[PDB]
Specification:
heterotrimer, A mainly beta (about 200), B mainly beta (about 210), C mainly beta (about 220), A: about 200 residues, mainly beta, Alpha-Beta Plaits, 12 strands, B: mainly beta, Immunoglobulin-like, 6-stranded mixed beta sheet, binds a molecule of 2 linked components (NAG-NAG), binds 2-acetamido-2-deoxy-beta-D-glucopyranose, viral protein, immune system, SARS-CoV-2, Receptor binding domain, neutralizing antibody
Chain lengths: ~200, ~210, ~220
């Protein structure tokens, strides 16, 4: 049968809504989108050539176009280029420790591209922030959005910035003449979930 | 969508005892389940997430378990701060993020018979044209209790309102008031007013009366 | 610390609308989703809906679509719940909470709640009547009849008598509230010493002291 009046709505996954979004999140307040009930054609991504990083963990590109998953989650944010290496299982650094932490047993892909043309400004882009101070490291996929003043000394802060009392987020301040490692990179992390449940995300 | 139900609706247990309460989902929620505690008059607080992981700042005497559609919250060695209401909530697939109906955990103690007191209308109320007869049934346990009003020996059901207290924070008993509201004219047409309380502690009612003629 | 500070109690007439607020501190609401939850008296929790203050997007439980409108003001870090065409079924405590749907472990931070009461009754002060008896401790009481809205508070001897006090929850009788309070004291205390119930009904600016005198 061919029904046009009420068609089959299950089509290719809307990766464009994630990868080509105009607004991207700060890494401390990283964005998550749930992908479900669609066909995941990953070859639009695989052979795109526009990416600086395309690293897969526990899964292989070109094989992604096969097999099913329960759901896919897509996390997205901006970091500097020299921090992309921290978006990997088992890494350390300000980003992995205080902002976005992958689990050791991660199954998924980490994709990044240089966004200097969109995300830097002559006077500095102050919209993208990262967490610089935290009392302990994040657990995997933990997301800390606190703005509480960090007590860096023996004197209490009572909610006011001052000596040894720091606002915990700092701006990257991207400017277009930065060296490549200090330029902004947009990052998408695709995590593949497999439960004993109906699969809703399948390849073609 | 997923519907959530809890059992039991209410449970009484002694301090130091261990209890288990249950949450059932209408479909498989794959451990995407949270439990909350709510004390009277306060907001809920998160206790357990992912069915079995304790939230920060929760004592280890709480434990969550289960799978599929059936989940349990166990409390080992109950402490006084644990009495209150408990709710489950699922986070499977998409909203609504529905809650169960709740389970109220109350304190179990030794049975106690009510102390019964009856009060005639005040002269001030009678001067205004009304007449409320009040009976207090104080400091009893368990909470189930029956009160019967008799006027000149005949049972009276109309015009009676009852109110129970929450469990007393000191002795864990309940109390109840029962009020018979009449007009002054109706009150003055009868002589003897009686309240009779029947409670599991005895097959015989506890009876208190007065006579308007003194 | 994280705090969600909600607006105060509302008493409104059927058919009216009300707009409740929740002001967050310790985080920016644009960085998460703000949810609202309803709890009717002696009833369970019901999820109403949520907003994403970063782009305005909302989701509602179908039963609250139209009744409830959630908005946010990121500049003042405040989320709002507007309830329209109110009826008695809307009388409830409403809570705001934070929850980033597919990341957070559960609803970790909640406001204190806002009580909404929908009624066509008029503010009415109570009548206060003494309950004196017509072997053992003596039980006395006070009958607080015919008031609206809730609450009333009752103390005994301005708090000097605190033990042996029971104040019963209000019940509706002829579309007004009535409650009573009892105090139990030694027979050597009353009537040798004065015992007075102190009743306050702040909605009507009423304060009444009633001495319990023997019959
Ligand atoms: C609508 O189209 C989708 C995609 O073709 C169908 O879902 C797939 O169904 C085949 C079997 O026919 C499975 O092998 C795939 O794994 C499914 N993929 C996904 C992502 O579900 C779906 O059955 C079609 N619906 C109707 C009513 O024909
Ligand atoms: C993003 O947009 C470019 C064109 O601007 C397009 O070539 C590419 O396929 C898009 N990516 C996705 C995932 O849709």
């Amino acid at each position: 049968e061919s029904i046009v009046r009420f068609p089959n709505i299950t089509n290719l996954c809307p990766f464009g809504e994630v990868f080509n979004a105009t607004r991207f999140a700060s890494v401390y307040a990283w964005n998550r989108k749930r992908i479900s009930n669609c066909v995941a054609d990953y070859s639009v991504l695989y052979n795109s050539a526009s990416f600086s990083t395309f690293k897969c963990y526990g899964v292989s590109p070109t094989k992604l176009n096969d097999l099913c998953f329960t759901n896919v989650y897509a996390d997205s944010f901006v970091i500097r280029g020299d921090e992309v290496r921290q978006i990997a299982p088992g890494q350390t650094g300000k980003i992995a420790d205080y902002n976005y932490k992958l689990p050791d047993d991660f199954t998924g892909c980490v994709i990044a591209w240089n966004s200097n043309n969109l995300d830097s400004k002559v006077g500095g882009n102050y919209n993208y922030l990262y967490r610089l101070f935290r009392k302990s490291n994040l657990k995997p996929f933990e997301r800390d959005i606190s703005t509480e003043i960090y007590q860096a000394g023996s004197t209490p802060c009572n909610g006011v910035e001052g000596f040894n009392c720091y606002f915990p987020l700092q701006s990257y301040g991207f400017q277009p003449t930065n060296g490549v490692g200090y330029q902004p990179y947009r990052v998408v992390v695709l995590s593949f979930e497999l439960l004993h449940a109906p699969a809703t995300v399948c390849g073609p | 969508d997923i519907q959530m139900t809890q059992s039991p609706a209410s449970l009484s247990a002694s301090v130091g005892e261990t209890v288990t309460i249950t949450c059932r989902a209408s479909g498989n929620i794959h451990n995407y389940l949270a439990w909350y505690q709510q004390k009277q008059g306060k907001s809920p607080q998160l206790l357990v997430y992912n069915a079995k992981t304790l939230a920060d700042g929760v004592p280890s005497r709480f434990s969550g378990s289960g799978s599929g559609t059936q989940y349990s919250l166990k409390i080992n060695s109950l402490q006084p701060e644990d009495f209150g209401s408990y709710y489950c909530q699922h986070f499977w697939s998409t909203p609504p993020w529905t809650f169960g109906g709740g389970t109220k955990l109350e304190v179990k103690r030794a049975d106690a018979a009510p102390t019964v007191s009856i009060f005639p209308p005040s002269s001030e109320q009678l001067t205004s044209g009304g007449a409320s007869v009040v009976c207090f049934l104080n400091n009893f346990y368990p909470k189930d209790i029956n009160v019967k009003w008799k006027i000149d020996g005949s049972e009276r059901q109309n015009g009676v309102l009852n109110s129970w207290t929450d469990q007393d924070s000191k002795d864990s008993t309940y109390s109840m008031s029962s009020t018979l509201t009449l007009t002054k004219d109706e009150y003055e047409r009868h002589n003897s007013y009686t309240c009779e309380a029947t409670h599991k502690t005895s097959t015989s009612p506890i009876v208190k009366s007065f006579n308007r003629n003194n | 610390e994280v705090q969600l500070q909600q607006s105060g109690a509302e008493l409104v007439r059927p058919g009216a609308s009300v707009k409740l607020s929740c002001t967050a501190s310790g985080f920016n609401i644009k960085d998460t989703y703000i949810h609202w939850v309803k709890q009717r008296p002696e009833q369970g929790l019901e999820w109403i809906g949520r907003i994403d203050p970063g782009d305005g997007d909302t989701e509602y439980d179908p039963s609250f679509q139209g009744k409830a409108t959630i908005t946010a003001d990121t500049s003042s870090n405040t989320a709002y719940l507007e309830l329209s065409s109110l009826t008695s079924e809307d009388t409830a405590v409403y809570y705001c909470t934070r929850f980033y749907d597919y990341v957070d472990y559960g609803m970790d931070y909640w406001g204190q709640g806002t009580s909404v009461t929908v009624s066509s009754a008029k503010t009415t002060p109570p009548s206060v009547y003494p309950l004196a008896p017509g072997n053992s401790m003596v039980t006395l009481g006070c009958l607080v009849k015919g008031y609206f809205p809730e609450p009333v508070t009752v103390t005994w001897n301005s708090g000097s008598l605190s033990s042996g006090v029971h104040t019963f929850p209000a019940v509706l009788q002829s579309d007004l509230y009535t409650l009573s309070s009892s105090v139990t004291v030694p027979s050597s205390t009353w009537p040798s010493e004065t015992v007075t119930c102190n009743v306050a009904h702040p909605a009507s600016s009423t304060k009444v002291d009633k001495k319990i005198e023997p019959r």
